Amino acid sequence: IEEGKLVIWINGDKGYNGLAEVGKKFEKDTGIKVTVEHPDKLEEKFPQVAATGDGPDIIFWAHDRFGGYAQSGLLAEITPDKAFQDKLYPFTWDAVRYNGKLIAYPIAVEALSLIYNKDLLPNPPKTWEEIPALDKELKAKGKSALMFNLQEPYFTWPLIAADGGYAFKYENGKYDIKDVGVDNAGAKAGLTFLVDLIKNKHMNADTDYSIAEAAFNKGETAMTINGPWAWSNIDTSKVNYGVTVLPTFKGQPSKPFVGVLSAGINAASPNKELAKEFLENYLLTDEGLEAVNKDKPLGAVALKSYEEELAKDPRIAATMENAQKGEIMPNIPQMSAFWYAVRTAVINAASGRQTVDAALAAAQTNAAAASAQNITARIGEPLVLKCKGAPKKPPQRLEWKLNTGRTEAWKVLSPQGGGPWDSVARVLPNGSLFLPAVGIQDEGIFRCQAMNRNGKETKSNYRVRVYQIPGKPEIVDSASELTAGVPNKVGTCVSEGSYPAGTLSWHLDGKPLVPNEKGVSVKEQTRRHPETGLFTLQSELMVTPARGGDPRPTFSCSFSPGLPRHRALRTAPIQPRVWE
Ligand SMILES: OC[C@H]1O[C@H](O[C@H]2[C@H](O)[C@@H](O)[C@@H](O[C@H]3[C@H](O)[C@@H](O)[C@@H](O)O[C@@H]3CO)O[C@@H]2CO)[C@H](O)[C@@H](O)[C@@H]1O
DSSP, X not given: OOTTEEEEXXXXXXXXXXXXXXXXXXXXXXXXXXXXXXXXXXXXXXXXXXXTTOSOSEEEEEGGGHHHHHHTTOBOOOOOOHHHHTTBOHHHHHHTEETTEEOSEEEEEEOOEEEEETTXXXXXXXXXXXXXXXXXXXXXXXXXXXXXXXXXXXXXXXXXXHTTOEEEEEETTXXXXXXXXXXXXXXXXXXXXXXXXXXXXXXXXTOOHHHHHHHHXXXXXXXXXXXXXXXXXXXXXXXXXXXXXXXXXXXXXXXXXXXXEEEEEBXXXXXXXXXXXXXXXXXXXXXXXXXXXXXXXXXXXXXXXXXXXXXXXXXXXXXXXXXXXXXXXXXXXXXXXXXXXXXXXXXXXXXXXXXXXXXXXXXXXXXXXXXXXXXXXXXXXXEEEOOTTOOSSSSOEEEXXXXXXXXXXXEEOOSOXXXXXXXXXXXXXXXXXXXXXXXXXXXXXXXXXXXXXXXXXXXEEEEEEEEBOOOOOEEESOOSXXXXXXXXXXXXXXXXXXXXXXXXXXXXXXXXXXXXXXXXXEXXXXXXXXXXXXXXXXXXXXXXXXXXXXXXXXXEEEEEOSSOSSOOEEOOOBOOXXXX
């Protein structure tokens, strides 16, 4: 991370151009450049890059992700004074408190609403149950009733929760991580209703954010479900729209999750004071929030003064009506596992590949499962796993067990005794498990239970994966002269010795080179060595140079692992020439 500037990550559905305008004002006053980026999957990328001390100085996301980041030590504790805190609503600060510490600045409160086309549907439906009949009416007129994003569980949750579904039970000021409400009767009822809509062709399981937005904004469907960030595109489309309370289900309100868009500071940032100045004195002001809100609406902002100014907007009132029928998202680390579990359940049930009951049963199990620490190790290198709670020397009451490619199911280990397991995984004096040289067959789960004389029990739970770095990639079978107007084989990139497979990518003039566009094609193959299990990849690049184009291209190929266990590897560049 570069000292003396600010890099900000925010999702691509938010007002990033407006935020960049706030950054320009900061730059005018301070000379400090503010770069706003909107990477894909930034909420998954952040914990990867920040864990190694890289990433943005500031990350924006709803507050639900932040407990996990904080637990991993990826966030700086913020230091607003009490006078600053008093400028924002107390419930918004609660959303960004983790283990007693403020770990992000709250920006705005979001909830989904029903958005409807007033020219098609003057009185929007009060119930989910009336939507099939409404769709039949509209289909007869060449339209449809409802389209919304069915790929992300955020959008389907309000219906799943209505009749009794919940994420984690809240009681005594705490979430019970084992009391999950994903496969109860209420969740099943809601998801069954959704799936029936799809079975009856009132909705399509493939509908995503872009498809639903396009259909609504072109006047093809009478309703959608979306948040405040979507309003600006509807304004542009000129559709005469209203924003209103979500339909009820079985007579009960839909319960959207309430998200607080929040800004965290990277623990690894050398620019923490600049970040504080930007967030407190530039962004969290009437003029700062206005700039962002004018780009894509924020909802009900956390800053009291500006929230009061905008409160008269009936779309914001509807957002708050819906929010106040729903639940605040927990910020606990287990929220990630909950969302992944429910995403899978909804996709599998909606596609018909699994019953609602079976999909939700699996999701329940996954969401409530004990957390495991992800461990990675390079093939051939040693690995040490701590038995938390064990005394530093014997006697120790502990038990290691594992479930890997070397075992059928669970194997319980014993103290060293000369048996063959001792050369693969053995218990050290301090109770740790030592694997002298990991291999592919060691991937799996490793667990320790340590018991103390006072009755204390401590469990350690590890999910172990391994990797190998291939040799530097090479380009072979390359053609140094290219002919415009016909396909030319630039060469074949080859990488040998990876685990897992990884992928090869081509680049032209220091930018990625995209297949099937502008006369580019790639033929790829993967081979696995029968004994070692390591992978060899090939990627053959064809290009059709355009006549009059740049006759001096520079190509290169790189290998990347799926997860960043190591850096990309690159070939030397090649510089074939286009000759007439
Ligand atoms: O579905 C897989 C997905 O799950 C998790 O994403 C959840 C977000 O963490 C949660 O905030 C919410 O996201 C919505 C934003 O709050 C809202 O501002 C707007 O951007 O729409 C978002 C939904 O698309 O809900 C999602 C679950 O749908 C997890 O964090 C992700 O890594 C994972 O991809």
